[PDB]
Design a protein around this nucleic acid. Sequence first.
RNA 1: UAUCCGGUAAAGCGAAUGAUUAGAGGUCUUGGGGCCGAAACGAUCUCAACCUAUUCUCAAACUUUAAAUGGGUAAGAAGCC
RNA 2: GAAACCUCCCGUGGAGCAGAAGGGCAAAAGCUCGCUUGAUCUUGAUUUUCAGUACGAAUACAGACCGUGAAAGCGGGGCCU
RNA 3: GUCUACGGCCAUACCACCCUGAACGCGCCCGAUCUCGUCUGAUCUCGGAAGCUAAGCAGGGUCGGGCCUGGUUAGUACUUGGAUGGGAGACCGCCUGGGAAUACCGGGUGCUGUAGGCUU
RNA 4: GCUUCCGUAGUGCAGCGGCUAGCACGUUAGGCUCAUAAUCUAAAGGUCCUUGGUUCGAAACCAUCCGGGGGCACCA
Lengths: 292, 204, 159, 169
Amino acid sequence: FVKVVKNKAYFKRYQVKFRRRREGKTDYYARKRLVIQDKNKYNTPKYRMIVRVTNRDIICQIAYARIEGDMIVCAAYAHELPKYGVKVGLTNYAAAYCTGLLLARRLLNRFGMDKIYEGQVEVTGDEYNVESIDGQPGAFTCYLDAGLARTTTGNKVFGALKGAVDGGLSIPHSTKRFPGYDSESKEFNAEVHRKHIMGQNVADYMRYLMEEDEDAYKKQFSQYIKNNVTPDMMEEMYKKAHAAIRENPVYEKKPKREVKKKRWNRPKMSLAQKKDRVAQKKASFLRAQERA
Amino acid sequence: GRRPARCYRYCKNKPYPKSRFCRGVPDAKIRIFDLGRKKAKVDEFPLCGHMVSDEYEQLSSEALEAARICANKYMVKSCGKDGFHIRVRLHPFHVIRINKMLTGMRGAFGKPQGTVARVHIGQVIMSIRTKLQNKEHVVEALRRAKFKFPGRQKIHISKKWGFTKFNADEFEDMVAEKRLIPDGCGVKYIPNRGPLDKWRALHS
Amino acid sequence: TNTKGKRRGTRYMFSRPFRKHGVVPLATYMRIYKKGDIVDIKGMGTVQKGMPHKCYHGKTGRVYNVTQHAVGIVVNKQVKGKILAKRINVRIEHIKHSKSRDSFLKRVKENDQKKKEAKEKGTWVQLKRQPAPPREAHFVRTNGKEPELLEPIPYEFMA
Amino acid sequence: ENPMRELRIRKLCLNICVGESGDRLTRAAKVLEQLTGQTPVFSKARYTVRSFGIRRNEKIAVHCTVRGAKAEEILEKGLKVREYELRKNNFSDTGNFGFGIQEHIDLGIKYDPSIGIYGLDFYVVLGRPGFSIADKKRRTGCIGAKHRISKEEAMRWFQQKYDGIILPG
RNA sequence: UAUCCGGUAAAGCGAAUGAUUAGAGGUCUUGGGGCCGAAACGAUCUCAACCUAUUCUCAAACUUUAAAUGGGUAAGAAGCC
RNA sequence: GAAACCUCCCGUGGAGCAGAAGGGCAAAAGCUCGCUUGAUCUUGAUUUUCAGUACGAAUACAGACCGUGAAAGCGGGGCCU
RNA sequence: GUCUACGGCCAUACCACCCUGAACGCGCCCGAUCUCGUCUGAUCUCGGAAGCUAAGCAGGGUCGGGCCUGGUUAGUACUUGGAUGGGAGACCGCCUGGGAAUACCGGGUGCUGUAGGCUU
RNA sequence: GCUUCCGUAGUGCAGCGGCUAGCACGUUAGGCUCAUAAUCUAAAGGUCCUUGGUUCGAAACCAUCCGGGGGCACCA
Ligand SMILES: [Mg+2]
Ligand SMILES: [Mg+2]
Ligand SMILES: [Mg+2]
Ligand SMILES: [Mg+2]
Ligand SMILES: [Mg+2]
Ligand SMILES: [Mg+2]
Ligand SMILES: [Mg+2]
Ligand SMILES: [Mg+2]
Ligand SMILES: [Mg+2]
Ligand SMILES: [Mg+2]
Ligand SMILES: [Mg+2]
């Protein structure tokens, strides 16, 4: 036996936390410093750019909080990349860069800032900040939201951040936690970052497995042999993907029709049904004990 | 020895118990609060004779001890050594204070002197359960125990079954319906809200 | 005498209610406040900077200054012989909206609508409030049966 | 017919508690380093106990958690010492077990007059594919109710894997 | 008339903190006076600290609740569109 | 061994936050790390005992210069009294 | 009908056990070369897809515990104002108005916003 | 009244929370001496005043009660 800690008194004194806290999704201590606007602004949105890394997806959204819940003003998913050229490799650093770039260019041509603030067209790898142009509508500002991801040097959240900055979103940041940062000498090489953006870290390991052994290469990159993805095709493929994002980042929905409207879920049992169930269980127990 | 109970009779001050703040309290005179054949079931002592006060006052622990000894002695001489069960339903916790002289009133706060029990109007002082053939002896025992307390008390043979909260006319009906389980000195109530495994452990 | 501390006797005032401890919810952080808003004050034990004094807990004033993450408010304090309109700077979490003005604003909107209505018609409609009137004399019916005779119960001793 | 309910050794925890400080502690650290191939981590005290000769924050013991095939090989050495036999009371309620040996030289470690005599203590922590939820970052949760490892399951897994001759009592 | 503030009376402690009465069922788990035994968690119970539902009495410096009496606000031209 | 060290599970805070007590706090306001000196300079306004005078303490701000973090922001001494 | 990401209210949402998950998901999972940090790729980070609903998660159930909301308790305890009311007092009764909380007994067991999917 | 001190074999006492309650004066051996005086060491030596409580464990720490004893209580 044990001394039962979880008693009726324990459940009476027990206070639950918030719903997203119990699910394990929201850092409220982080969001209380992120999302609240100063009160001398009185109505303005405070735009945050949320990056969430999934095992098979990358979600990059731009939102602002209201009292009835926040409203997404723009969204971008990493599974929109087969519409642009990236057939496979939807969850790596280059896909995060393309998702952030698509988010930025979609927000710019939905607000009307397509021609003004072109961003970094020719990708270099250095530091970049979007400066406000006088006589023009100002540059969009938003603040990054990494959520519950440990932000070390070389994160896909920061890759999507660099993609949004190269798309033209005026986000305050630093080159300290971009990949390529030297930890013991504290300078930014700005060429290793270009290799990570263009995807040479994956292609060099493809070449390494190709010279090591064919079976482990196939096991690691089975859908890179599928659709004919060679390591020499990789940089030109991401160049064509970036060009496709810059020439057409607008989004189209789909005509959701022809739904049979059936119920895959089990409906809820009612009061008379539960009372009849427990009455039948009592009667069945009495009928079982009136036998011997 | 101590000051007479004319001075410590009425509920004059706030209830002042022994706690972390009030330390150094002398121990109460009454130690055992219930005796007789207390190792007994509810099915054999259906008497439920109560001493009920009629004044909002304070009763001392030494008076509780004296009335317990008097009721115990008369019930042993009347019905037997193990034919009754006496509870004293007043546990004294109010610490009374003493201001003894050799200054005078200069910085006059009391040291703890003893314990006393706040008694409401309509509150049970003592309770005796035994058989139904014992009513006059229980009434005379409580009458002899009234003479150790100040104020005015009453003796009432209640409608309950011994030391339970249930009425005696419906007690045997609830036991026959197995809504009540005889559990030691008291009784256990079964609502229709538990799990069905408890119902299956019963009724078989 | 007592002590002159700022939080003297705030054991229940500047405390959180039962099973409502923990993280302050975020809509409370992101209420908006303008100049002249009627605002009541309720102190919160979690947030401790910008806390008002205990003589303002439950008092209601109007907003004169809106800073970055605090609100200035002109409250009314009765200092023994006179009521003073005095200005205190209270942080957001110790501040709600007072709904004593909202029913007045809805009544003003209803009166403006009922004044624009029936203005070209010529009829005069009573727009003021009126207290509880006499209960407008009527018939109390019964379907043949008689009223139930109540009886004072006989006394029996409970204890 | 269960596809991925295969019970596996999640880790193997080694420790040596030399008791006091210093030279015996770093000597047992050298013992654990020669046993594993990785630098172990020392463990200090919680509070001062006068009867044990220990003080607060004084380094007492040394430990090392081993994962995978190296833990499999070290536990093969340990059961090769302990004759594949355990008891009923050696198994915990959560399905993890352990045992301690009195001489580290039974595991194949060569003797040294300088690096002296040290017993050590193994604790096998068993696992399943799917116990990363209880220690991952964002969406933690209790790993089911019929998914936990039971004592009966630990007994039958040990008898199926290492040919268990577990004796009662 | 609407809108907030309380933690006092009352009540509760089969809800937390502190005190505190007695039965019932369970080798959680040891130990002391003990009895049958060289001993045994082998049968009998005991108390110190154990558990499970019960039961009796409380708290100015306890409280899930929680009044009556009170305390601020608004009942317009210094207001709306 | 009841307390040395390792692991699993339960664990609403029943621990800790320098002290007396109260309140407050669970991916903190606690412990351990990494960097630091907002514990810097200069005008006013306000609260607290109040006569609405001081002193002490505190509250939002304003101008600079900074620290930290990827940023939101936080900090011009101590979680508040 | 339902899921994902971010949520508002913060247990009608939690906790214990059992059953069901088609598709998109979400994850479990496979490894450590690159970025990264550990005694240990267990955690974190990175590169993926051979299996899987076993687990999380979603839905339902328990004469479930808890929680929310009602009746009883009870016009009871208490309480504003009043009397040349009673009583040696303690306290109690009336007029005048308000008015609880246990135990006990019923019902329910999450709604909703934004953006994007699946059941074409 | 207040501040206290001590309750431990027949006796004076001692006792760093973990001892077999050191040990001496008595009672009873026994060794030794030519026999005796002192001994140098052993046995039958403890209602830790009493109750209650924390700790794993109490004479040792805390609270009450019960017995012996020390000192202060000033001007009109
Ligand atoms: Mg953070
Ligand atoms: Mg008095
Ligand atoms: Mg008070
Ligand atoms: Mg009271
Ligand atoms: Mg932190
Ligand atoms: Mg400044
Ligand atoms: Mg601090
Ligand atoms: Mg892994
Ligand atoms: Mg599953
Ligand atoms: Mg399942
Ligand atoms: Mg229920």
